[PDB]
Design a protein around this ligand. Structure first.
Ligand code: NAG
Ligand code: NAG
Ligand code: NAG
Ligand code: NAG
Lengths: 541, 535
């Protein structure tokens, strides 16, 4: 039970030991506050510094999670596959919901060590940071993995568009946890000048929105964005006042005055606000990051094109097939999806995503022709793989390449990768590969610790080898900034020895094809990526 | 030896010229056999008729005169074959005795009934002759009777006004007359009037397909081989015949408002006055050519095949790798292909003078620019030639060939498809180009089996001789029974040619490494046939 004196008092951890023999013991400080709780009048206000406590504080038990409703109407497509499949197992973690969230979990192993802050969340109104045990990652890579809880949903992202409720309260909590780390990690042994930030899904969009901000000026140095970006359709909210008024009407006080409505919402209880069941438009979000002027000044799209950011390092990537939830109705059919429904599915994809009345018949017919296999036009079974790739390319792959190019034009080291592996789960078909959010088990060393309630995968030796490689690639980035130099790719127990990860250049757009058969490719779907970035903007507008 | 064969109109005497090879037997050549009454006078601009019988024995030993033409004028460069345009001076020695007393017929009888393979020459509709191709090697190797003819070309055989004064299609009516003459007299020479194959290239194939879509040639021939040509191209038929007829007439001597008066005066002028008048059509279009009138081609070459109105002949279509080699001609002597600033210039010009639709060309121009790009190698520059060349090959030749093959197979009829992939090593041709337009003609006629000629000065290696024997076997086998695989055994040994079905679009990859592929340019072909009409 080591005691480490911080700048706000003293805490006490534990010395829990991992189940492996090649991993040393770690010291865990679970439940370290980093902001005064927004229990009362602090709701819909930015966080502040914590209050110092006398004596020594218990830090052993996992902290309570921010209020959320895991059995409501959450956006299903945004969530990772393992979150939706194992919903009952994931609901056990979020049981002690309370507004006294905003705690911090530290996993210190046993020069100053690096720090790796993890921004959780598949959507903007679900999840908690207790699901990810970073003890294995911290011990293997000799880094200090830290996971946090931040306000979610209405409580942390409600905005009206005016000064009454600016919004982005969840983003300010993430910045506050970075400021706390920049001032208190030296005692635990970390280095405040080598702070790495990483996430996945909606957390990855928070990483990119944190980069294009002035509040996070000199807090962290590097960044990782796994299967996420800040220019997707479901990244930022462009209709904040509309969804607030629907919420205000449902609770009971839809006052005309913006200030009056906000004050009433502060009077109501937390559970009443969370369980209101407000549903947004398809492929969008209801409550999320809102452009206000402080955190996100004007627009994520405009911000990167104007070159206004502090030039951080980056490590972007995507998976093979992430639109696995785009094709779900035709998932138990003997032979794929029929041509009657392929046209209807593609047609619906355009109204609720483009919907432009300035010429749509040409746009609808152009993408029907391109996402086809004219050499095997009447296959039928592979129309699923084509429809799955239509959603993956448009929503994930194309924005990731556009972000990598914009971050590499202004000189900044950028590393691109594609994940081509998954574990044989229970309820997933054998034709899909590397669904959304499937890189998390390997980056956190799940196969090296065994099966988990969230991951019922039966990991073989090949899955163990891949995890020891992904963690090595990720950790080397946090140590020096290049996934190759500080640590070699040795078995320590293999085609990973001879491969060198090269930078992503705007004209030589190389990447690393992570998998069981790695290879440094040259261009990821250059035909389909260029279709969405070059041709499509010339069709509707 | 000078054998004599009696026909229905008289007697003719041939020659027994022996070939330069040992594995080929001697052939008998009846050069200059008439098949229509010579239309010198008022018979101009009128359909032909049967010849007049000649008493005694007629001599058929020397090659006949060619129809009037202007081979040193402003001919369509793109339409003509590559071997014709390069050796324009060597090809002009054949067309020297130009006279209106053309419409003769050349026969090459080898040494029970043998098939007949009538060859329809022509790269454009106003040039060429039947003497350029010596079908002695093809006749001796395949044991068939090869026939080459001369028909009226250009103004004298295709001038039309759209009225009854001059219907047009006079050149087409002459080709049918040769078939009618062959179907009525080839029995004496030893041929089989029930197995008459017709084949051609370039503008010969365009009038092969037009002969299928007609009622005049109902029970005359049986099969058809179309090499690099269709009836649905831009330069296949003429849709504005009156505009060019008025342009020609006003240039020569006449601007009479009445159509009949203009036709009568044109008959008064000499043949050389009309031919050498230098009338130029629009780009990728023809000035004097086949025109829809109602007698030969009733309604439209596109409409007729869509309604399934023909007599269900066997067919054999094909194309080459790159035939638009003349499309990329100005930027042919540059260090690094074509510049990206000149790529969208030729594509915009291609859309400008070929579609020209005021219903929105901005979307069409950007779509075909993006389709024909190599984003994996966006900055190659030299490779941009291979995509500009392939843009013209796909639009003009490959897409109509596949559309014609499908439409002739939906209505039950055998169709065979091929793609040529070999060429002769010339002197003025670039090393990267492959199988330009008309580069399959030397192989089908067995030129390498006899040696390089004036028209084809390429140095033919041992592979070219091997390929020519195979190509002449497939063509001969088709003309014998209709199946290029069965009658005569032949990596060509184990290769079998499969029919072209509309859903199983198999073809043959003729070349040094034969294969039976499944979909030729499926992505690009389906772009022109399906997406473009929606744009
Ligand atoms: C820390 O936790 C232990 C629980 O075993 C408790 O006994 C102890 O009093 C705590 N120390 C504090 C609150 O300072
Ligand atoms: C994992 O293995 C156990 C024991 O063999 C089995 O019961 C279970 O179904 C397996 N699960 C998967 C996803 O393969
Ligand atoms: C016919 O041709 C033969 C062979 O060339 C020749 O000997 C004969 O004189 C010719 N007859 C006439 C009338 O020209
Ligand atoms: C033709 O090619 C052969 C084979 O390489 C060579 O021996 C011969 O000299 C060549 N002749 C000419 C005229 O190029």
């Amino acid at each position: 039970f080591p005691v480490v004196n911080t700048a706000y008092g003293r805490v006490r951890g534990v010395r829990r030991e991992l189940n492996n023999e090649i991993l040393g013991p770690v010291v865990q400080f679970l439940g370290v506050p980093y902001a005064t709780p927004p229990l009362g009048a602090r709701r819909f206000q930015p966080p502040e510094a914590p209050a110092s406590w006398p004596g020594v504080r218990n830090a052993t038990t996992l902290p309570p999670a921010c209020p959320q409703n895991l059995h409501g109407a959450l956006p299903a497509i945004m969530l990772p596959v393992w979150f939706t499949d194992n919903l009952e197992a994931a609901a056990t973690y979020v049981q002690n919901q309370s507004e006294d969230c905003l705690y911090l979990n530290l996993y210190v192993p046993t020069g100053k060590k690096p720090v790796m802050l993890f921004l959780h969340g598949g959507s903007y109104m679900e999840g908690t940071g207790n699901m990810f045990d970073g003890s294995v990652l911290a011990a293997y890579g000799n880094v200090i993995v830290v996971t946090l809880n931040y306000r979610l949903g209405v409580l942390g992202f409600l905005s009206t568009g005016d000064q009454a409720a600016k919004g982005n309260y969840g983003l300010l909590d993430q910045i506050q946890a970075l400021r706390w780390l920049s001032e208190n990690i030296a005692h635990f042994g970390g280095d405040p000048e080598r702070i790495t930030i990483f996430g996945s899904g909606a957390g990855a969009s928070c990483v990119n929105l944190l980069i294009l901000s002035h509040h996070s000026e000199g807090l962290f140095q590097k960044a990782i964005a796994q299967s996420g970006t800040a220019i997707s359709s479901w990244s930022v909210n462009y209709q904040p006042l509309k969804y607030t008024r629907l919420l205000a009407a449902k609770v009971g006080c839809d006052r005309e005055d913006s200030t009056e409505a906000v004050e009433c919402l502060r009077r109501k209880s937390s559970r009443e606000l969370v369980d209101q069941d407000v549903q947004p438009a398809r492929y969008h979000i209801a409550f999320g990051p809102v452009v206000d002027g402080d955190v996100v000044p004007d627009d994520p799209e405009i911000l990167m094109q104007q070159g206004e950011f502090l030039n951080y390092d980056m490590l972007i990537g995507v998976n093979q097939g992430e639109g696995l939830k785009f094709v779900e109705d035709s998932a138990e059919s003997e032979d794929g999806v029929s041509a009657s429904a392929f046209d209807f599915t593609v047609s619906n994809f355009v109204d609720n995503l483009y919907g432009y009345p300035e010429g749509k018949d040409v746009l609808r017919e152009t993408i029907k022709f391109m996402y086809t296999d004219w050499a095997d036009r009447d296959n039928g079974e592979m129309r699923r793989k084509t429809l799955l790739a239509l959603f993956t390319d448009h929503q994930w792959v194309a924005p990731a390449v556009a972000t990598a190019k914009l971050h590499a034009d202004y000189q900044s080291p950028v590393y691109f990768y594609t994940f081509y592996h998954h574990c044989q789960a229970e309820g997933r078909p054998e034709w899909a590969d590397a669904a959304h959010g499937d890189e998390l088990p390997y980056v956190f060393g799940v196969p090296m610790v065994g099966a988990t309630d969230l991951f019922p995968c039966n990991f073989s030796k090949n899955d163990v080898m891949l995890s020891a490689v992904v963690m090595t690639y990720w950790t080397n980035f946090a140590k020096t900034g290049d996934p190759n130099q500080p640590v070699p790719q040795d078995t320590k127990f293999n085609r990973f020895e001879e491969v060198v990860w090269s930078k992503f250049n705007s004209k030589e757009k190389q990447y690393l094809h992570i998998g069981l058969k790695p290879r440094v490719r040259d261009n990821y779907r250059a035909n389909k990526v260029a279709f969405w970035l070059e041709l499509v903007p010339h069709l509707h507008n």
